[PDB]
Amino acid sequence: GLTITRIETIPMVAPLAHRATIVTRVHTDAGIIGEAYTGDEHETMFDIDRIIHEELAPTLIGQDAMAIERLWDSGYKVTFDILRDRRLGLVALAAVNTAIWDAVGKALKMPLWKLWGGYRNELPMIAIGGYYGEPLGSIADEMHNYQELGLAGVKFKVGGLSAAEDAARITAAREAAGDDFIICIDANQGYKPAVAVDLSRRIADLNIRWFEEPVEWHNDKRSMRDVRYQGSVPVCAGQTEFSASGCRDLMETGAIDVCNFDSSWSGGPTAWLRTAAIATSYDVQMGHHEEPQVSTHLLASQPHGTIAECFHPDRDPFWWNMITNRPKLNNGTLTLSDRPGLGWDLNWDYIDQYRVS
Amino acid sequence: LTITRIETIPMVARATIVTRVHTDAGIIGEAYTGDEHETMFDIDRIIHEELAPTLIGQDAMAIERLWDSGYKVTFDILRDRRLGLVALAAVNTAIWDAVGKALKMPLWKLWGGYRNELPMIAIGGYYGEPLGSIADEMHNYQELGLAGVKFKVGGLSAAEDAARITAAREAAGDDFIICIDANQGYKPAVAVDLSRRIADLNIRWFEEPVEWHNDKRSMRDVRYQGSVPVCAGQTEFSASGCRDLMETGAIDVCNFDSSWSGGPTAWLRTAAIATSYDVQMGHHEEPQVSTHLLASQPHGTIAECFHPDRDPFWWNMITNRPKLNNGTLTLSDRPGLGWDLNWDYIDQYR
Amino acid sequence: LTITRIETIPMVARATIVTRVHTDAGIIGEAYTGDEHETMFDIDRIIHEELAPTLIGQDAMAIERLWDSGYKVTFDILRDRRLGLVALAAVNTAIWDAVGKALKMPLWKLWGGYRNELPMIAIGGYYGEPLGSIADEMHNYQELGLAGVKFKVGGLSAAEDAARITAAREAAGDDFIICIDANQGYKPAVAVDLSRRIADLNIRWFEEPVEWHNDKRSMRDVRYQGSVPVCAGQTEFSASGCRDLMETGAIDVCNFDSSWSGGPTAWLRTAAIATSYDVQMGHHEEPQVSTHLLASQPHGTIAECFHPDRDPFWWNMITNRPKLNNGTLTLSDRPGLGWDLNWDYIDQY
Amino acid sequence: LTITRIETIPMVAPLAHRATIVTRVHTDAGIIGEAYTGDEHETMFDIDRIIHEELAPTLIGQDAMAIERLWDSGYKVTFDILRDRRLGLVALAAVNTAIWDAVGKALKMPLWKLWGGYRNELPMIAIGGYYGEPLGSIADEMHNYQELGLAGVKFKVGGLSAAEDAARITAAREAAGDDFIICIDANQGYKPAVAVDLSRRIADLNIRWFEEPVEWHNDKRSMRDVRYQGSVPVCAGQTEFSASGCRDLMETGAIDVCNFDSSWSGGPTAWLRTAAIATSYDVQMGHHEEPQVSTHLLASQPHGTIAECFHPDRDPFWWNMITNRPKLNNGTLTLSDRPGLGWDLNWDYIDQYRV
Amino acid sequence: GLTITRIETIPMVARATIVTRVHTDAGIIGEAYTGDEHETMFDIDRIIHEELAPTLIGQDAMAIERLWDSGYKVTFDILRDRRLGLVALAAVNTAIWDAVGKALKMPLWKLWGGYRNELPMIAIGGYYGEPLGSIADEMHNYQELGLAGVKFKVGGLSAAEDAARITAAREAAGDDFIICIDANQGYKPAVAVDLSRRIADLNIRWFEEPVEWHNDKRSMRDVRYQGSVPVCAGQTEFSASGCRDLMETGAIDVCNFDSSWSGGPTAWLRTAAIATSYDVQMGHHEEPQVSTHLLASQPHGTIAECFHPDRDPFWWNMITNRPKLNNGTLTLSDRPGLGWDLNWDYIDQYRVS
Ligand SMILES: [Mg+2]
Ligand SMILES: [Mg+2]
Ligand SMILES: [Mg+2]
Ligand SMILES: [Mg+2]
Ligand SMILES: [Mg+2]
């Protein structure tokens, strides 16, 4: 057993070279402190904090942290509120579930990537870039910059221009980076089905790893399934779903080749892992929208896990400042250590400088 | 936790195989699985020739890695796919026992820890009255402290079997779980007829009600046209098949059998899928493992066992079997499966 | 046409069973079926202990009645369902031969009579070059007058297997049918990659491209993301299973194997279901029966056989096989299956 | 056996009108396949024209034994985009049925056995319960069917509220007693909710099935809901054009029984394909009227159910056209071993009403 | 209210059609012509007067849902082609809508949504036999008439043969010309797929009714995914439920449901709503005198279609104030209702009875 004593949270806001997050810590009778920072909610940061303390904490204090199914089942009720954005409870539940897994890993002396399956302990990491207006430099310079940082590739932003114009942008990225570089594209639900199909066929010769959320939100399942069959690039989605059931609907419709369900936005690892299990029955691969501090372990643990993702230092200060023992990228790969739990050494100097109330 | 040796102990007294995974640490993962008789040796052969080579020298802690490479034994297009699934389940279960012990964790908690106690029923009601009349059978199970029974049907007309079910309830009383199993014996209409006739007998569920070829859609119709929850899954070969059952709307409960389909790793995937569908989990017999699997899950239901007269392994091989209390079996905190095998029994038969 | 006796003659020369259904008239229905070796005697046991009791003394002419009664042999929860299905197929194929003879009708015509000729391809391209180089094997099949080959793949990478397939096309030329069979060997992504790579080699179809567990949905994706038609069905246990493949949109062609799942009666049901889906019919090996089955249907495709070096029954069991002409086989008007069995050969059981 | 001539004889006969085309397929041997099908009246001469101008050219000089080959070539008459598709389907059914009769004779086989031979006898019910009581009161009508030896009735509903139609059906069961089959047919007349209401109200009257309970447009899904929310098995298929359509009903879970009408859907060849599909869905087979062919079709299949006819005052053809019609015994009709359809047509009647 | 006082029908043959006119108690007369039913015209005329008129005479033409609901029962007769009743209902529904538009002083394209009042138009051509001249000739001609493109008929030859014909149409017309193809349900799936892949480079707008009728939904969905050209259908469906099925199967990129054949604008507009929830575009099988308004009103409408003058005297003669094509596009006026001015001399010349 591992009895929980109290829940401590540290909301923080940091400037971009703003991004926000909540450090959640679960103290136990044993002295082990499960901790992690999740999400990026900013306008609703303090609302989530209130849910964590007034709604979840009472269901956790004095409880056995190792009875994860039991604790998750009771906390799930925060997602029942009919009067507020369902993501509020889901993020709060995820913040707590993640911190709890970190405590369980430490108690058992097991790194989470191995405790969740241990398929492998290393995977490639790409960067989310290619923003319109090139705030991070020209396409050539941005691509080269990621390669100098030792990244395995990029998830290039599209969905804002015509099929032809974005097709030219993607072409410039492949030309600048060369062949040994992973290139995924993400339209953030911006295209009409026909335009996405057009783009997909235009880039058929560029070796695009996958086409993330190609179409508009309302009928995304069926429409992206058509992008998948009429086009030429594998399709990825799942980050906008609220639950494992939603990801199951995506897979049943045949809308995706990869699911990038975001645990920090949907109830945590416990929820993500269920989605992972469903994916295997569908031969669908697992991805994960950002949140590298937790996705690296989640993805590595599964046989069908793919690639981890991060932002450029200028766009995300947390991954690059919050953890003082981040492994060094080698050949585009990140190898996780055997440190128990998430195994991260948080930079308390940074936390103290940017924590807020 | 490096695996060092794969030891298997086949035996007949009902037949099973005691599989043991030895590690470089003092740990020995062990568990008996399945009840294959005529294929026991073929399975044993797959375990030592095909699986042992993929395990020796490997880390038992990276379960997904091992299961993945061991899965290839289910690919053989020239033999019953069940052979490979059972062999894989034997090794997977033993490895899980080793990991439980290594982490000093009982499997019911390591697998989720939803609860540590659940009711257990017996598989009875066989045609022919090998255990005496219905009334006597029901009383005997109540004497043994069982929570209820999984009553066999599917061999007579609807009115006929409906009468046998009624006899079970009358004799047993209201506080006794009554599940029925047709083992794919009825035509859709007959199952519906039966389901409606027993609508007031508070039947827990109706297991595999219809013939095999179109079971998914046909039992889905028994489900909606009938009056009783439907259960199936023991005949599926993988999580995908159970997923099909759920996608079709054919079941209220899934009783996928881990010892028959790739072990706990496979069963836990099916359980995950069932949560996304709001389907409950059960498990076709094999209490030495189902108690842990089922208790670990928030949607787990009931554990099953045979009457001592029909199964000597559960009752004779585990020296530390929890005492049934008010129909419930509570699991201890012992690591892994936490079972103490009666080696005197083992040596006697093998 | 009362059934008076059920006789079986197990064989090993590759193993099969010669089933003979004797009737009150001088008519004897007969056919050999399945490639069962390890389970041969269990299947023979089913036929005699479970099926014979539902046949002897009954009218061979009332096929649906007999099949309905014998189907129960597939209900056994304690054994490989294939045992019962194979046993049922043996008996069902023999009685159909008997009915064909009684009605003086050749089966290809009695089952529909769409046509009496169809292309014949050889199952080959085995890994390891057991019949020589790719080029030599294709030429060897070409020498035999075969219409094409069902080239084995699913074992190497997309690039590697795609190379082999390319060597086949090159060695054989354009007018030669090339189908490939991965036997459930690839993962969706690899099959899709392979399919796309061979898009210009004019492949007839891609059989069992993916791993078994989620085959239906996974091959449907191979079918839609790939570039070649997909074929499956041989691994299904019944017409319901094939109906499932079709409903999922997994196949362009269904190669349901009659000898593995209840016989012609089951297969003809699957054939009917296929017309409602615009799906074509094929048939996993078993040329001694598939030729009639496939020719009888408007959506039938190609019959298949093994190289003589790998299958001696088709090339030796039947003393009157039609000779291949332009890659095509033409069936005679001989009633029933119309096969003359070599009884000297039979002495190998 | 070579086909030498396609002969058709359209006819009209008074009720208490009803039309049908007798089709005869002459062969070079001494065999003439023949059967009458459909009940088209306003389009009878258009169908007759399709048979002679479009189908005959694909049959004359051809081998009648190659049924799949002929049906395939004849199917093209269903492709005409500018006319009711039923026209071609009925024409095709006419020739296909006559051809099968010819094949059965050539092989000396009754069609019930050639098509499968599951059994040679089945119960026979009468379609009745028409509103306005044209055949007498509910009690008198039911009794009349019992005196004629019928096994039951297919009672017409779908025209009143749930309570009123339920009262009508109750009167049927009360008048007939328990040993009488009672099916109901709404002919697509109710809204889903009303059909469900009726279905639950009659849950204790042991209704065999509920035929086409809801309006046409969304029938598959709506009747599927009547099927699951109600308490009576649901039957449909007669309004479908092809086996593919019946497949759609089955896949949707809309039916327990399929009553695909071979007479206006391409003939026995099409019906038998639907039958095969039905076995894979565990769905039973029925057939909308057309007793002269449904008896053989239904009896041949393991999943076949009941044959149907109309009261003599309602249908003069089944009761006058065949002179060797088996006598109903205990609600059942038993087919003979006579080859083909095995029917002896009444030529006196034909000459009197052919038009 | 806008009380209906009389239903008038003017059947005619010149190609056949029925001009329906709904008289009201105001000073408004709803009018329009629909369908091209020739052998069933009088049968349809009968339904209109014998079945629909009694439900209309003396009713408020402004309550369209009410009137359409009671009229819908003409589609229930299971003893006649369901199209007779659907065509009759459409004729009356369309005339009523024209009356409503006039009463509200609103052109229909704007009353039904008003997305835009301008859209391209192509001609249904490519007939085999060259009834209008060689492939290149016919194409240059549609070009002169100011059409945006053509809907080229196919489905009669092999994949290679029809591909060659399509290739010739593209060759002659050039890049800036819309080219749709229609097989009218004539190919086997494999043939349609073959053809689709062969024309992958000719920029074909869509492939209409590629496969045989019986399993058209699932079969054209496969042509859609195995091929390279978007697929269009719906004209052969009887109702919105039918189009809904097509969309749910994933069979179409575009739905060309024909209002003249299925209950009129009220039904077509329901199909449009359904199409939005599925990201499916709207088209319309001919009937330019009504499809221009229906299509233009919707955010997802595509292109209107017509026949070559040599083939359709009605669209080119019936309407005396037909907008003049410009750059392949036809713009609609603000004239209330359908806003068409019929030539009564032409009507008087070819009206029949
Ligand atoms: Mg994204
Ligand atoms: Mg069971
Ligand atoms: Mg194969
Ligand atoms: Mg009816
Ligand atoms: Mg068209």
TrEMBL record, chain A:
The keyword Metal-binding applies. Keywords: Metal-binding. It comes from the Bacteria. Mg(2+) binds at D186, E212. This is Mandelate racemase/muconate lactonizing enzyme. It comes from marine actinobacterium PHSC20C1.
